[PDB]
Amino acid sequence: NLDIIGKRIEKIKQEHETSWHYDQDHPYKTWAYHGSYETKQTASSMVNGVVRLLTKPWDIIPMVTQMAMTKEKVDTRTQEPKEGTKKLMKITAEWLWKELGKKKTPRMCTREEFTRKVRSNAALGAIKWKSAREAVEDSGFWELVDKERNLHLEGKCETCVYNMMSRAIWYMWLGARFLEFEALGFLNEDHWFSRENSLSGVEGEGLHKLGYILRDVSKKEGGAMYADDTAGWDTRITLEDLKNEEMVTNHMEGEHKKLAEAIFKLTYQNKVVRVQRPTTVMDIISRRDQRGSGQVVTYGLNTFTNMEAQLIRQMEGEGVFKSIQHLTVTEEIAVKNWLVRVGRERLSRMAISGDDCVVKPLDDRFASALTALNDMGKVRKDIQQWEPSRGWNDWTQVPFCSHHFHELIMKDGRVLVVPCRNQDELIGRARISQGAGWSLRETACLGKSYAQMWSLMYFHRRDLRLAANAICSAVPSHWVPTSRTTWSIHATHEWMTTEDMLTVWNRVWIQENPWMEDKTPVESWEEIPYLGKREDQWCGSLIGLTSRATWAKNIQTAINQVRSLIGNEEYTDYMPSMKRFRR
Ligand SMILES: CC1CCN(C(=O)c2cc3ccccc3o2)CC1
Ligand SMILES: [Cl-]
Ligand SMILES: [Zn+2]
Ligand SMILES: [Zn+2]
C-alpha cells in the first residue's frame, strides 16, 4: 500500500506543505483518499471556419451543430471473479501471450523513437519546460528520467502520478510517459496486435480493410455475428486482469524485464491520481484496479484482455467447462487441449479493437453464454444482465469501430468493401478543431486533412465527394494537410499527403488491396461509384433537399468566399473531376 505509493504521496505533500489538509468531506468510497491542497486552474471544442463555410446546408441540422457545443463510473468497484473464472483467465492469458510471442521479440523502445514521436507531434497524454519538444533536448529532463528509471530498477517510484481530467484521460508528466513507452511501447511499435500476428486484432489495418476483414469472418461456418459493447470497459478492468496482462514480462529479460515489471507493479496495479474537485481543491487519491495508462498501451492491453474474455465466452458456448464456481482438474486439461486444438481457429472468428469486438462463434449457444462474461465484470451495455445477446445475420449491418460496411460494385464488376457512418457524424467532426492559437493557414490545412480522408474513405457518399472537392479547391494546392482527422490505432492515414488523391485511391483500393485480383488502374473519379441514391439518403445524405441543390449548383461562390479570406495564393479547381461540373 503506502509502501509503494507513500514516496509519491509524501513528495506531493512537501511541495504543498502550506495548504495540506485531511478533508472529511471527500466524495470517495472506492478510491482511497489521502489528502488535499489549494489549486486555481481549469479547452473546449472550437469550430473550423473553412469546413463550416463549405458545408452551409448543415448549419440548420441540429445533429451536426450540437456536436460543437459543451463521474458515476470511475467511483465504482468490480467484485473479484470466482475461482473457476480466475483459472480460465490465467490459462487463456498464459496461452495468448505465448501465441502473440511466437514470431515477435519483446524489446525496449528508445529515447530516439520517443524523441521522433514528439518531434513528429503525437498524442502521448502529457502536461520547467512548456512544450514536450523542448524537454526532449534539455538533458536535465533525461536526468529526471534517469533518476526515476534507477528508482524503478530499485522497485520504487517517486514522480509517476496521474492527472485525471464515458471518457476521462489520465495525463502524466512526459518522463512518466517515456518510461511506460520504453517498457511496453514494443506492443504497438512492433504490431503485436496485427491481424497477421494476433489473428483477432486489426491494429494498423486501416478503415479500407476492416470491411473486407468482417466479410472474411462472415465466410466461416457458424451462427450470427455478435457485437456486444461493454458498459465502461476501462472502469471494469479487475486487478486479476492487470495480473494476467503483467504475464507479458515472463517473455522479457534483463533490464527490460525489471523496467516492465515496475510499470505494471508501481503505476498500473497501484496508482496515485490528482483530481481537481471544485468544492477548488486537489485530492490525492489511490486505487489498485481499473485501466489507467497511456492511450496506446491501453489500446494494446484492452485488445489483449478482450481477446481473452471473448475466447472464454466462446469456450462457455461450446460447453468446454460446466460452471465458473470451480474448475475440475480434467476441465483445466480440456480448456488447454481446446486452446491447443482450435485456439488459433477461434481467434480468426473475431475482429477486436480495444474494448470493441465482433465474434462469429461456432453456433448461437454463444448468445446465452453469459456467466463467465458477467463474472469477469465485462457486463454488456444496454441489455438485461441475463438476457441473451441479439446477433446480426448480415456482415453489412454489424457495427465495428463506429462504422458499418457496404458492398459496392464498380461499373467494371470489381467489388469494393467501403466504410460508412451517419453523414451527420462525419460533417460534425470535420467542423471541430482542438486547442487554441490556430492561424487561418493551420485551420485550412486541417480542413484539407478531412477533405482528403473523405475522398479516400467516403468517396461513395455524394455529399462528401462534392464537399471534399470544394475544400481541396478552396485551400492552396501545395499547402500540406496537418493534425489528425482521427487517432484510431486501426487507422493508417494514407490521406496525410500532398500526392494526387486519385493516385492514392488507386494504390489503396487497387494496387495494395489483397481482395482485388485485377490491378487495372482507374483513370478518372467518374469510374469510381457511389452507394445507391436511397442507400445514400438512409446513411444521412441531403440529396433531394432544396438547400443541398442550391449548395451544389452555387459551390464555386462558396469556394470563392474561402479563397478571398485566405488571399492571393495558388489554387486548383477540382470540381470538373465530377460529371455535373464537367461543363
Ligand atoms: C431518395 C432519392 C434519391 C434520388 N433523388 C433525387 O432527387 C436526386 C438524386 C441526386 C443525385 C445527385 C444530386 C441530387 C440528386 O437528387 C430522388 C430521391
Ligand atoms: Cl442483420
Ligand atoms: Zn515511477
Ligand atoms: Zn452506410
C-alpha span between 450 and 51 (Å, rounded):
9
C-alpha span between 20 and 37 (Å, rounded):
5
H/E/C letters for each residue in 509-527? HHHCCCCCCCCCCCCCHHH
Reduced to 3 states (helix: H, G, I; strand: E, B; else coil), residue 476 is coil
Using the structure block, give the residue that is written with the C-alpha cell 451544389: 552
Question: 405 forms bridges with which residues in the sheet?
Answer: 419
Q: Could you please state the CATH topology (level 3) that the domain comprising 1-38+110-184+239-288 is classified under.
A: Alpha-Beta Plaits (3.30.70)
Which ligand ends up closest to the CA of 150? 3
C-alpha span between 119 and 114 (Å, rounded):
9
Residues 465, 530, 580, CA angle at the centre, nearest 5°?
60
Ligand 1 center to residue 580 CA distance, Å? 13
Q: Nearest to residue 564, comparing CAs of 57, 47, 46, 53?
A: 53
Q: Cell triple for residue 493?
A: 492515414
Give the Å distances, CA to CA, from 132 to 174, 274, 359, 552, 558: 7, 21, 40, 44, 39
C-alpha span between 317 and 484 (Å, rounded):
41
**Contact of 82 with 325, CB cutoff 8 Å:** yes
Q: Nearest to residue 78, comparing CAs of 375, 276, 403?
A: 375
Residue with CA closest to ligand 1 atom 1: 534
Q: Nearest to residue 303, comparing CAs of 340, 352, 371?
A: 352
Reduced to 3 states (helix: H, G, I; strand: E, B; else coil), residue 47 is strand
Which residues are annotated as part of the binding site for Zn(2+)?
Answer: 148, 152, 157, 160, 404, 406, 420, 539
Q: Burial of 40 by CB count in 10 Å (0-12 exposed, 13-18 middle, 19+ buried)?
A: exposed
Q: Nearest to residue 375, comparing CAs of 74, 8, 79?
A: 79
**Contact of 385 with 252, CB cutoff 8 Å:** no
Ion ligand 4: protein residues whose beta carbon lies under 5 Å: 420, 539
Q: Which atom of ligand 1 is nearest to the CA of 548?
A: 14
Question: 480 forms bridges with which residues in the sheet?
Answer: none
Reduced to 3 states (helix: H, G, I; strand: E, B; else coil), residue 193 is coil
Ligand 1 center to residue 553 CA distance, Å? 14
Q: Provide the resolution (angstroms).
A: 2.0
Domain ranges of the chain: 1-38+110-184+239-288, 404-581
**Ligand 1 touching residue 461 (CB < 6 A):** no
Residue with CA closest to ligand 1 atom 6: 544
C-alpha span between 208 and 217 (Å, rounded):
16
H/E/C letters for each residue in 515-576? CCCCCCCCCCHHHCCCCCHHHHHHCCCCCCCHHHHHHHHCHHHHHHHHHHHHCCCCCCCCHH
Ligand 4 center to residue 536 CA distance, Å? 7
Using the structure block, give the residue that is written with the C-alpha cell 519546460: 129
Mutating to test ligand 1, I would choose from 533, 538, 550 the residue with most ligand atoms within 8 A of its C-beta, which is 533
Output the DSSP codes for 395-461: TTT--BTTBEEEEEE-TTS-EEEEEE--HHHHHHHHTEE-SS---HHHHHHHHHHHHHHHHHHSTTS
C-alpha span between 196 and 192 (Å, rounded):
9
C-alpha span between 252 and 260 (Å, rounded):
9
Q: How many helices (H) and strands (E) does the chain have?
A: 23, 11
